[PDB]
Amino acid sequence: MESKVVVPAQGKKITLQNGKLNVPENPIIPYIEGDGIGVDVTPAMLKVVDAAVEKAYKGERKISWMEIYTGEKSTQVYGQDVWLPAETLDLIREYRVAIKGPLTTPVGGGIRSLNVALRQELDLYICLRPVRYYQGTPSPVKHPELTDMVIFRENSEDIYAGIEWKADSADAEKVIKFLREEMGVKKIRFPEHCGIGIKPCSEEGTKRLVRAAIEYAIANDRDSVTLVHKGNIMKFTEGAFKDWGYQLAREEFGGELIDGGPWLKVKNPNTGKEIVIKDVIADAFLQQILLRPAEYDVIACMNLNGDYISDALAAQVGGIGIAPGANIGDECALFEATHGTAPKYAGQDKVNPGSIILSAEMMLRHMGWTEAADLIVKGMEGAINAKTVTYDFERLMDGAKLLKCSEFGDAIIENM
Amino acid sequence: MESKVVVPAQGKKITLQNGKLNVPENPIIPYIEGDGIGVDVTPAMLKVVDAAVEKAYKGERKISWMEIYTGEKSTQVYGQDVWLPAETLDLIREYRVAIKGPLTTPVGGGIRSLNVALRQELDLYICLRPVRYYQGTPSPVKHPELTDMVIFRENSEDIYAGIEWKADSADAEKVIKFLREEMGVKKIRFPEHCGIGIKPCSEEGTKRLVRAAIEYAIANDRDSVTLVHKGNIMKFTEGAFKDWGYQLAREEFGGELIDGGPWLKVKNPNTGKEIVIKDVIADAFLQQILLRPAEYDVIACMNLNGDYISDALAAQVGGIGIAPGANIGDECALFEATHGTAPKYAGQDKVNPGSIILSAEMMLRHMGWTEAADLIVKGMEGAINAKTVTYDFERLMDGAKLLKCSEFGDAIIENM
Ligand SMILES: NC(=O)c1ccc[n+]([C@@H]2O[C@H](COP(=O)([O-])OP(=O)(O)OC[C@H]3O[C@@H](n4cnc5c(N)ncnc54)[C@H](OP(=O)(O)O)[C@@H]3O)[C@@H](O)[C@H]2O)c1
Ligand SMILES: NC(=O)c1ccc[n+]([C@@H]2O[C@H](COP(=O)([O-])OP(=O)(O)OC[C@H]3O[C@@H](n4cnc5c(N)ncnc54)[C@H](OP(=O)(O)O)[C@@H]3O)[C@@H](O)[C@H]2O)c1
Ligand SMILES: [Ca+2]
Ligand SMILES: [Ca+2]
């Protein structure tokens, strides 16, 4: 019905032309609080960003936060069963740059993921997750400092599309019949009481993702792009991802064979560095990141694999309490921590706000406000090195001081 | 045509009745050499097993090895394009207990996996992979000793079924048309130039796997069974796996709520221990194994997830050079390392034979030859503690002696 969103009177809208953002001194930034621990981490992110912006520009610049709604809080604002109001999608696109806390997705039934809904409806086809080591962060591995990677996760297709039917349903039986009788499929071991999902992977979806990964490698003078896939078992989806990725590198970036292949080199047109384009089968890759972390840099992979890789890598540098991300499309960008709503901690002021804070760091950098972004990095490193940290770091360390979520936010500010 | 397999004159066939193996003193055991590094690890496994058997039983018992064929070597024995002769399947079933080196599966085209073909054709629906720490093994993690888990990976369905069509093929277009027009599917982002795979998960496939996992937990007095799944995003496949797994625990093993759930406890009828039945979402699980390894024990998961988990966990305890496995069905069992053919090392006598050797350890234990199995464990621990090890361990250690694959086999024997 009537919108409950309040456009800030003091703010102005970020604009986009020529693919370049025009960010005013007083930009309006929509944010979603998030379900569960969103109630803890979001207020910490708001105060930390505001402090970094104030310290960097001395009042010349200020973000006008505009709360928008999705998830539990939306049902309370807009009414029962309003989980994702249309205006939320419209406002994120209109305002160009936004940030969200995590959203709860029920298992085995219930609503489809609102996080996926946002990514899909806004065509935010890049899930960008940098994973790097902050000095002083406790880690289960001996050399966390060797992990410095950037995940480019395809964000619009794969088994994530949400195409599936429940076992014993008329639809599942309908699909199973089609597959067996019309497609001559014989490899369904138990066609009765059988759930069915569909996994699509397209040339266009692949290439736009890999193109972004390669451009990022060029823009940031990175060393390599590794295509991760399970293309021996899934030849026509994951295997195609690998083939299209290599093809894209050759056709658009001049990739050439390294010593007869199969890897390619792409010459960085800005620095002259030869960027290696390579690939690793996904299961083997989960060992490679632990046993040979220094050999990997930019990672390009499909939706599901990227999901797994995000948590696995984050764990090497302290866990998903320190794992930022962004969902990026051609028209807008929605910043977002890797982690979920961790309901068991929700409202305890306990979890690590580092992830959403570092997602705001990416947002600020995205906005060209690099000085403010630098202060967040500085404050984060300062607080961790001072061993004043949240429970997830404290349990992996001797002699640390346990801080609440809110207190760790203050610690970051104190270290700016 | 004419079989090229030679049945050993001195051996006798293992038999099965009442689900119990009757293993003669002179059992015939089929083995497949394997492609690639199979040429290195298989001869080491043969000599190590023979030594353990000789030392344990002083000539009273002896394995009559019978080479059978699949993969590259089969094409050379039986002719071009004979990759998996029917007799190989027949002989594994007939002889009840067999062991294989790894087999090469091409990426993005070429033959479908022979490893999967064997598992599927023989209905070896359990992929059983124990992951534990051998003292003295180098590791990227600080506390590898906290990892002591057993993977039960569903081995007959999931996206592994091999049901998929190539982008732009008549069949893919046919399936895409069916999905869009007859099933009203709207979530395929790019329906053109689009590969398509099918992911089936059934009640029966799930329950037989989880039943085995729970029985193993009972038989070995383990602490918990964790169901790993991505059931928030794949509600009707992975989410169903989780639901059926819990249901099975309740209906067949008397599982009861722990403090109002969602976890269950299953009382061990032999020891009285309460076995915890729980679940973790798959991405989060890849952090859990690193940050809270001691909280996990028996793992039950679907085909693909188990594939990933096998390598990720193995890496915590030295990598897939020390990662054994078994494919187990109701009628026979085929032992097999977790690792592949690593073609870049093939024939260099370089890789770690530990994995296939420890798979033979499982085979021996499976045969009730526990004394021989114990000697393999002892020799393995002895060689590693002596820091005489293959390249994969040597690079993670200071002051080790680098051994060839064959030499490490001798080192194991020397330490029996
Ligand atoms: N993009 C998103 O909004 C998003 C992402 C992932 C999951 N989810 C949703 O969240 C719900 C719960 O999923 P889940 O429990 O598997 O994942 P989760 O909410 O990320 O929690 C998994 C574990 O990760 C650790 N963790 C998560 N956030 C943390 C933080 N801020 N600081 C420190 N540690 C943190 C905790 O580990 P320990 O308890 O071991 O210390 C937590 O129990 C699901 O409905 C899922 O759909 C949403
Ligand atoms: N069940 C099977 O038969 C099986 C299983 C997996 C893969 N494969 C097949 O094998 C082929 C190659 O796949 P891939 O290269 O991704 O996997 P891979 O053959 O397992 O090799 C991956 C990496 O794992 C390490 N590794 C593997 N075996 C080892 C050993 N015995 N000792 C020490 N380290 C070892 C090596 O790591 P580093 O080089 O980093 O030291 C190797 O490069 C594919 O065709 C695949 O289909 C078969
Ligand atoms: Ca995730
Ligand atoms: Ca594997």
In order, the DSSP letters of A292-314 are SGGG--EEEE-HHHHHHHHHHHH
Check CB contact under 8 Å for A198 and B199.
yes
Is the bond preceding residue A24 a cis peptide, omega within 30 degrees? no
In the structure encoding, which two tokens stand for residue A249, read together?
């590198």
Decide if B325 contacts B379 (C-beta within 8 A). Answer: no
Q: Is the CB of B348 under 6 A from ligand 2?
A: no
Q: Count CA atoms closer than 13 A to A132's CA, side-chain side.
A: 12
Question: Distance of CA B289 to CAs B225, B280, B295, B297, Å?
Answer: 14, 11, 8, 10
DSSP B12: B
In the structure encoding, which two tokens stand for residue B218, read together?
């009972």
In the structure encoding, which two tokens stand for residue A119, read together?
């990514």
Residue of chain A minimizing CA distance to B200: A196
Tell me the C-alpha distance between A65 and B320, whole Å: 50
In the structure encoding, which two tokens stand for residue B52, read together?
């353990």
Among A349, A414, A358, A361, CA closest to A386: A414
Among A362, A371, A367, A370, CA closest to A16: A367
Decide if B275 contacts B283 (C-beta within 8 A). Answer: no
Is the bond preceding residue A262 a cis peptide, omega within 30 degrees? yes
Check CB contact under 8 Å for B187 and A290.
no
Range of the domain at A298: 1-416
Is A148 annotated in the active site? no
Token pair 């918990």 in the structure block, residue: B224
Tell me the C-alpha distance between A62 and A52, whole Å: 10
Check CB contact under 8 Å for A179 and B156.
no
Among B73, B21, B13, CA closest to B42: B73
- CA-angle at A332, arms to A327 and A337, nearest 5°: 25
Among A365, A367, A405, A412, CA closest to A386: A412
CA A233 to ligand 2: nearest atom: 47
Mutation target for B interface from A129, A160, A177, A194: give the one with most B CBs within 10 A: A194
Decide if A352 contacts A321 (C-beta within 8 A). Answer: yes
Annotation: binding site of B for D-threo-isocitrate: 113, 115, 119, 129, 153
Ligand nearest to the CA of A283: 4
CB atoms within 10 A of CB A2: 5
Question: For the purposes of burial, counting CB atoms within 10 Å of the CB of B85, is it exposed (0-12), middle (13-18) or buried (19 or more)?
Answer: buried
Decide if A35 contacts A72 (C-beta within 8 A). Answer: yes
Decide if A124 contacts A362 (C-beta within 8 A). Answer: no
Q: How far is the CA of B226 from the centre of ligand 1 (A)?
A: 17
Nearest CA to ligand 2 atom 39: B342
Dihedral sign computed on CA atoms, order A395, A397, A403, A409? negative
Q: Strand locations in B64-142, DSSP E?
A: 64-67, 97-100, 126-132
Nearest CA to ligand 1 atom 9: A340
Decide if B179 contacts B188 (C-beta within 8 A). Answer: yes
All residues at 6 or more sequence positions from A145 whose CB lies less than 8 Å from its CB, including other chains: A133, A135
Q: Count CA atoms closer than 13 A to B336's CA, side-chain side.
A: 25
Check CB contact under 8 Å for B196 and A232.
no
Check CB contact under 8 Å for A109 and B239.
yes
CB atoms within 10 A of CB B192: 12
Token pair 């909280």 in the structure block, residue: B295
* Direct distance between the N- and C-terminal alpha carbons of chain A, in angstroms, rounded to an integer: 43
Q: How far is the CA of A9 from the centre of ligand 1 (A)?
A: 35
The alpha-carbon gap from A285 to the nearest alpha carbon of chain B, in Å, equals: 8
Q: What length does chain A have?
A: 416
Q: Strand locations in A188-305, DSSP E?
A: 194-202, 224-229, 256-257, 264-267, 274-281, 298-301
Tell me the C-alpha distance between A115 and A100, whole Å: 9
Q: Is the CB of B352 under 6 A from ligand 2?
A: yes
Nearest CA to ligand 1 atom 4: A340
Q: With H, G, I as helix, E, B as strand and everything else as coil, classify residue B149.
A: strand
Decide if B260 contacts B333 (C-beta within 8 A). Answer: no
DSSP A141: B
Is A297 annotated in the active site? no
Element (H, E) at A336: strand A333-336
Decide if A151 contacts A131 (C-beta within 8 A). Answer: yes
Ligand nearest to the CA of B107: 2
Distance of CA B214 to the CA centre of its chain: 17
Distance of CA A383 to the CA centre of its chain: 24
- Quick one: CA torsion of A316, A321, A322, A326, rounded to 10 degrees? 110
Nearest CA to ligand 2 atom 43: B342
Q: Strand locations in B51-102, DSSP E?
A: 64-67, 97-100
Residue of chain B minimizing CA distance to A165: B236
Token pair 């209109």 in the structure block, residue: A94
CA B101 to ligand 2: nearest atom: 3
β-bridge partners, B22: B15
Tell me the C-alpha distance between A1 and A21, whole Å: 32
Q: In angstroms, how far apart are the furthest CA atoms of chain B?
A: 70
Check CB contact under 8 Å for B233 and A199.
no
Q: A350 labelled as ligand-binding?
A: no
Q: A115 labelled as ligand-binding?
A: yes
Distance of CA A21 to the CA centre of its chain: 21
Among B177, B153, B239, CA closest to A107: B239
In the structure encoding, which two tokens stand for residue A73, read together?
């809080």
In the structure encoding, which two tokens stand for residue B359, read together?
């798979």
B189: which chain A residues are within 8 Å (Cβ-Cβ)? 120, 123, 156-157, 161, 200, 202, 205
Question: Distance of CA A409 to CAs A135, A348, A360, A392, Å?
Answer: 18, 15, 13, 15
Q: Count CA atoms closer than 13 A to B134's CA, side-chain side.
A: 28
Decide if A159 contacts A197 (C-beta within 8 A). Answer: yes
Decide if A193 contacts B202 (C-beta within 8 A). Answer: yes
Decide if A213 contacts A241 (C-beta within 8 A). Answer: no
Helices (H) and strands (E) in chain B, counts: 13, 18
Q: How far is the CA of A288 from the centre of ligand 2 (A)?
A: 11
Own/partner long-range contacts of B276-280 (Cβ < 8 Å, ≥24 apart) = B276/B223, B276/B224, B276/B225, B277/B214, B277/B224, B277/B225, B277/B227, B277/B245, B277/B246, B277/B249, B278/B224, B278/B225, B278/B226, B278/B227, B279/B226, B279/B227, B279/B228, B279/B229, B279/B242, B279/B245, B279/B246, B280/B226, B280/B227, B280/B228
B164: which chain A residues are within 8 Å (Cβ-Cβ)? 199, 234-237
Distance of CA B255 to the CA centre of its chain: 27
Q: Count CA atoms closer than 13 A to A147's CA, side-chain side.
A: 31
Check CB contact under 8 Å for B234 and A164.
yes
Q: Strand B388-389 vs strand B401-402: parallel, antiparallel, or unpaired? A: parallel
Q: With H, G, I as helix, E, B as strand and everything else as coil, classify residue B401.
A: strand
Tell me the C-alpha distance between A71 and A42, whole Å: 14
In the structure encoding, which two tokens stand for residue A59, read together?
């009042």
The alpha-carbon gap from B157 to the nearest alpha carbon of chain A, in Å, equals: 6
Q: With H, G, I as helix, E, B as strand and everything else as coil, classify residue B148.
A: strand
Check CB contact under 8 Å for A234 and B194.
no
Is B283 annotated in the active site? yes
A178: which chain B residues are within 8 Å (Cβ-Cβ)? 178, 182
Element (H, E) at A17: strand A15-17
Across the A:B interface, residue pairs with CB atoms under 8 Å apart total: 283
Element (H, E) at B362: helix B354-366
All residues at 6 or more sequence positions from A267 whose CB lies less than 8 Å from its CB, including other chains: A254, A273, A274, A275
Among A41, A178, A14, CA closest to A101: A41
CA B103 to ligand 2: nearest atom: 3
- CA-angle at B280, arms to B139 and B150, nearest 5°: 50
In the structure encoding, which two tokens stand for residue B116, read together?
């999967």
Tell me the C-alpha distance between A200 and B4, whole Å: 43
CATH of the domain at B228: 3.40.718.10
Tell me the C-alpha distance between B318 and B381, whole Å: 13
In the structure encoding, which two tokens stand for residue A196, read together?
């069915």
Tell me the C-alpha distance between B75 and B81, whole Å: 6
Sheet containing B148-154: order of strands: B64-67, B28-32, B97-100, B333-336, B326-328, B126-132, B148-154, B298-301, B224-229, B274-281, B264-267, B256-257
Which among B109, B159, B232 has the least Cβ separation from residue A199? B159
Is B187 annotated in the active site? no
User: Rounded to the nearest 10 degrees, what angle do helices B405-414 and B370-385 cross at?
Assistant: 110
Alpha helical stretches, state H, B165-271: 170-177, 203-219, 238-253
- CA-angle at A313, arms to B126 and A303, nearest 5°: 70
Decide if A332 contacts A388 (C-beta within 8 A). Answer: no
Residue of chain A minimizing CA distance to B166: A236
Tell me the C-alpha distance between A10 and A61, whole Å: 12
Q: Strand locations in B271-364, DSSP E?
A: 274-281, 298-301, 326-328, 333-336
Among B412, B350, B355, B409, CA closest to B381: B412
The alpha-carbon gap from B397 to the nearest alpha carbon of chain A, in Å, equals: 12
Own/partner long-range contacts of A263-266 (Cβ < 8 Å, ≥24 apart) = A266/A214, A266/A217, A266/A218, A266/A225
Dihedral sign computed on CA atoms, order A59, A63, A66, A68? negative
Decide if A201 contacts A253 (C-beta within 8 A). Answer: no
In the structure encoding, which two tokens stand for residue A204, read together?
């266009």
Overall number of domains in chain B: 1
Q: Is the CB of B342 under 6 A from ligand 2?
A: yes
Tell me the C-alpha distance between A228 and A245, whole Å: 10
In the set B90, B174, B283, B401, the catalytic residue is: B283
User: Rounded to the nearest 10 degrees, what angle do helices A282-291 and B303-316 cross at?
Assistant: 20
Q: A305 labelled as ligand-binding?
A: no
Q: How far is the CA of B39 from the centre of ligand 3 (A)?
A: 39
Question: Distance of CA B342 to CAs A318, B117, B325, Å?
Answer: 31, 20, 17
All residues at 6 or more sequence positions from B319 whose CB lies less than 8 Å from its CB, including other chains: A287, A291, B352, B392
β-bridge partners, A280: A228
Among A206, A230, A202, CA closest to B168: A202
